[PDB]
Design a protein around this ligand. Structure first.
Ligand SMILES: *[C@](O)(C(=O)NC1CC1)[C@H](CCCC)NC(=O)[C@@H]1[C@@H]2[C@H](CN1C(=O)[C@@H](NC(=O)NC1(CS(=O)(=O)C(C)(C)C)CCCCC1)C(C)(C)C)C2(C)C
Ligand SMILES: *[C@](O)(C(=O)NC1CC1)[C@H](CCCC)NC(=O)[C@@H]1[C@@H]2[C@H](CN1C(=O)[C@@H](NC(=O)NC1(CS(=O)(=O)C(C)(C)C)CCCCC1)C(C)(C)C)C2(C)C
Lengths: 301, 301
């Protein structure tokens, strides 16, 4: 037993991470088939970042201005193009370690694994969640842009995220693998507000079920609630509203524990109104909302 | 920036995880060169677990009683032997994905990455620490025995742990890759007490430096302490004693922040005596002790 924040095995993704250097900037790229994907602001100087015309900047770039490197292998760029915010660098060599993959755009509240890399070399792996305000709380230093987020579906690598920027809060923002940013953000160095962040309610309940599965039951109360009355408490504490879909998703967790979703919501109502009173849940003194119901079921079966 | 619990890339280890089935038991094995390493109690029935004579049990086993499987490949066992608590199954095929590796026995307080597997297939990756009482807090279901812990040193995979058992506490215990158990534990299903667990003090200080690097400074006080006076507070709260070696190890973190180790210990003294008063440090309402000074420096450079 035991419950830990767990990331997918990164082996299939490590063989796709390359180094991309354009002039003075070095970051990471994703090498699938014969294209290297990377954030388009690799072509920007520190001055260009303030107000870039990416179409004009890319025009002044030739193929030889991009030094792509996969370990010791050096990949020829035979062309370059732009897909909304990502630079697609066509190379003369197909990646022999290219896995079976898809490009997916995940929903707020869903989780994924990030393979943090620096100068094209993988550094570490950790699990993240797409916050309701379309940011993520990760660990990205200078040189980590281009690192990708992914899920492993059956026998398929589903790329969902590529890191671009850091927020004044300390949270991070990026795009899908088609270059479309998650959230209202644009790749320009200017003031941009992230939305008020809320707590993923269905994730908290899935995490409370994980605690019940692992023996932690002190928060279970013998009261129940309604979807309306709970959602009144939820919006007071900036918890995102619970729907009947969320109840159905938690079905496998409620069936395993024999505790209905509306029963668990009464326990969560008490925890929000009274706090934890000095106790812990799964070794945490705070409510955790970065485990999807799938993540919990994945770690219990 | 940002600070997250991070595990090493698992690609080099995934290509070594195989399935080991002996009679009715299925668990994981480690396929290096031409040997498969796995916990020796794979040969035990549920009845043998209570009081096993592993020498007598292994004698009744032939080579054909071990079904080893690497995905679809089926590996011939051409011999079997015992190295203290691990079964070494010699196979007729050398693993072509064998990386450069060593077998190391880590110290209490050090961390490593666990590649959790089930039926020989990798499931997830997460970071763990060898507690002072030689247990670990991981996520191991039925079928996870045989999963290994490892560090990646420069260009070398240092295997340090193989999972064997679960404790009544919910914590886990295992051996090094030479079959020697961490802690006083034996591979027998009988009452065995783990030692009183203590908090890794040098790890807490490294985690407090990480918070200072990432902007969290509310706990810094303008007092300092001595190594003696702090160790008096440390033993009261079951914190393991701080030595001059621990001070020297934190050198890179104290130099980056300009905050001496004895200064940070006065902040930790206040946090233990007064609690957190409702605030958080790096998004946690509890003191974290599973980040080594190396882990923090690794995530900041
Ligand atoms: C990344 O490309 C990288 O790893 N580069 C390698 C070469 C070193 C790099 C990583 C930076 C954080 C470690 N990313 C960037 O350089 C991006 C691109 C330029 C600016 N940043 C960036 O991360 C900015 N953040 C930023 O500008 N964020 C905002 C504006 S803001 O922070 O509110 C402020 C007004 C500037 C204070 C704009 C984007 C949306 C969020 C807010 C920092 C370098 C300041 C962290 C691009 C094009 C965004
Ligand atoms: C592992 O081999 C596996 O994944 N097997 C696959 C086939 C399903 C398996 C995992 C069990 C937890 C998920 N490990 C074991 O079967 C080991 C071996 C037998 C018993 N256990 C084991 O984990 C025991 N734990 C246990 O006996 N622990 C103690 C004794 S105790 O828990 O205090 C008690 C007195 C029994 C209550 C002995 C070892 C040291 C710690 C205490 C449980 C199955 C009960 C979890 C071996 C040889 C230890």
């Amino acid at each position: 037993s035991g419950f830990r924040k767990m990331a997918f095995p990164s082996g299939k993704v490590e063989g796709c991470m390359v180094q991309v250097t354009c002039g003075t900037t070095t970051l990471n790229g994703l090498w699938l088939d014969d294209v290297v994907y990377c954030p388009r602001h690799v072509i920007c100087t520190s001055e260009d970042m303030l107000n870039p015309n990416y179409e004009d900047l890319l025009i002044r770039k030739s193929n030889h201005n991009f030094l792509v490197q996969a370990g010791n292998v050096q990949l020829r760029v035979i062309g370059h193009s732009m897909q909304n915010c990502v630079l697609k660098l066509k190379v003369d060599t197909a990646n022999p370690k290219t896995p079976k993959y898809k490009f997916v755009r995940i929903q707020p509240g869903q989780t994924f694994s990030v393979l943090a890399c620096y100068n094209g070399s993988p550094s570490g792996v950790y699990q993240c969640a797409m916050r309701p305000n379309f940011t993520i709380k990760g660990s990205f230093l200078n040189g980590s842009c281009g690192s990708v987020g992914f899920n492993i579906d059956y026998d398929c690598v589903s790329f969902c995220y590529m890191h671009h920027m850091e927020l004044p809060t300390g949270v991070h923002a990026g795009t899908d693998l088609e270059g479309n940013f998650y959230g209202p953000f644009v790749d320009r160095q200017t003031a941009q507000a992230a939305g008020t962040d809320t707590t993923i309610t269905v994730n908290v309940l899935a995490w409370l079920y994980a605690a019940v599965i692992n023996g932690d039951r002190w928060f279970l109360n013998r009261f129940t609630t309604t979807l309306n009355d709970f959602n009144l408490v939820a919006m007071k504490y900036n918890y995102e509203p619970l729907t009947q879909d969320h109840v159905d998703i938690l079905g496998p967790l409620s069936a395993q524990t024999g505790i209905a979703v509306l029963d668990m919501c009464a326990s969560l109502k008490e925890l929000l109104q009274n706090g934890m009173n000095g106790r812990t849940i799964l070794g945490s003194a705070l409510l955790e909302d970065e485990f999807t119901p799938f993540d919990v079921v994945r770690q219990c079966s």
